[PDB]
Design a protein around this ligand. Structure first.
Ligand SMILES: N[C@@H](CCC(=O)N[C@@H](CS)C(=O)NCC(=O)O)C(=O)O
Ligand SMILES: N[C@@H](CCC(=O)N[C@@H](CS)C(=O)NCC(=O)O)C(=O)O
Lengths: 214, 214
């Protein structure tokens, strides 16, 4: 089977878990110890030494959105992640990029920082969530009538929402109610619920990080 | 025609110029004033307000690699930017991402910083250029036998090489001779030479930046 090198609380690795399950692709999950990275990880991703890595037919695919796109292309005959047209595909790439940049940067400040930087992060997080709310609009998914690439890129972060709300001491639903409705909607899918760890475990993880580093 | 909103010394906008010319696509170039951004730019890219933006059949495409991919998909019948197989496409995406991250970060430190940060940037730049040298190997292009996506992603920075060498006071050819041979090889293409400004103009631009900010 394809081998997925991963780390359980990673919102990035989770994207690969969701992608593979949404395709119905069977895979072997391997938990990496960053203090003791496997020979296969170091051989497969020598530049970044990061997860996720998908090893498929002897070839490594690195970077989580790259892996998601690879899964779409390697198993293209069912559950397409993208619309068929160039513009819709560019839209999907744009919004996943926005998640990888602005949203990712803001959320890390919320659970990973304290003081003024955390407060700044919380403001930036709320701005990002309002922008995403506006893009979703009244559609069931970012991909429209069907769950697709942008949904995969963002839904993994919903496992961290409890942690965001705890250390940011706020309610995401108050800021972006349709986004929260969307997260709940996606959680009805086995591809999502089986891929995302319990949010209480993520809280414990974030709590430990703050204890050790702040 | 498709409208390209751009800024002449931008290594990112240049990617769109190169992509369109490599496809033989006629376009209208518009020079944006960042102090006075056009209504079309603000309407087209309200989130980032950055160039390049390609406006095509009434629809805006934002982010330079996104634009390059869009050009490949919208004009797919000739000069393909990617190999046909999923793995080769994932490789191409990975390496363009490496250029957008590690290389882009390092080069900015070389021309945009002074002191220890510039010295760090110069070390990181040389590391990046050696990594890219290794990936290119003895192939004529990053895309292999033909100029492709990764070549487009990186070749625009060669217009900045003179500036890197000036403010970093060093020789890129000493560190990565095959990479320099590759840059010269690409400059033989009209799609590249017509898209890249004279490196002496870029030097003047960088010099002005350092005068005003360091
Ligand atoms: N841009 C990467 C980010 C992946 C990433 O940051 N992975 C983290 C875990 S969440 C990692 O592997 N860290 C390895 C380390 O700490 O050395 C992607 O989207 O795959
Ligand atoms: N990630 C973007 C970067 C583009 C970018 O940074 N563009 C700069 C010019 S090089 C810009 O538009 N700056 C606008 C501003 O300074 O407000 C891409 O690849 O398109």
């Amino acid at each position: 089977l394809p081998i997925l090198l991963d780390y359980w609380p990673s919102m990035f690795g989770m994207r690969a878990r969701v992608a593979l399950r949404e395709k119905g692709v069977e895979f072997e999950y391997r938990e990496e110890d960053f203090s003791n990275k496997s020979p296969l990880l170091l051989q497969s991703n020598p530049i970044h030494k990061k997860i996720p890595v998908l090893v498929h037919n002897g070839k490594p695919v690195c970077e989580s959105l790259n892996v998601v796109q690879y899964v779409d292309e390697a198993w293209p005959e069912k559950n397409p992640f993208f619309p068929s047209d160039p513009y819709g595909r560019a839209q999907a790439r744009f919004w996943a990029d926005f998640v990888d940049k602005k949203f990712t940067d803001a959320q890390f400040k919320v659970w990973g920082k304290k003081g003024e930087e955390q407060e700044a992060g919380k403001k930036e997080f709320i701005e990002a969530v309002k922008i995403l709310e506006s893009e979703l609009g009244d559609k069931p998914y970012f991909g429209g009538d069907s769950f697709g690439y942008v949904d995969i890129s963002l839904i993994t972060f919903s496992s961290w929402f409890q942690a965001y709300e705890k250390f940011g001491n706020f309610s995401i639903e108050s800021e972006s109610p349709k986004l929260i409705a969307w997260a709940k909607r996606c959680m009805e899918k086995e591809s999502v619920s089986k891929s995302l760890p319990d949010s209480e475990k993520i809280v414990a993880y974030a709590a430990e990080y703050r204890k050790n580093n702040l």
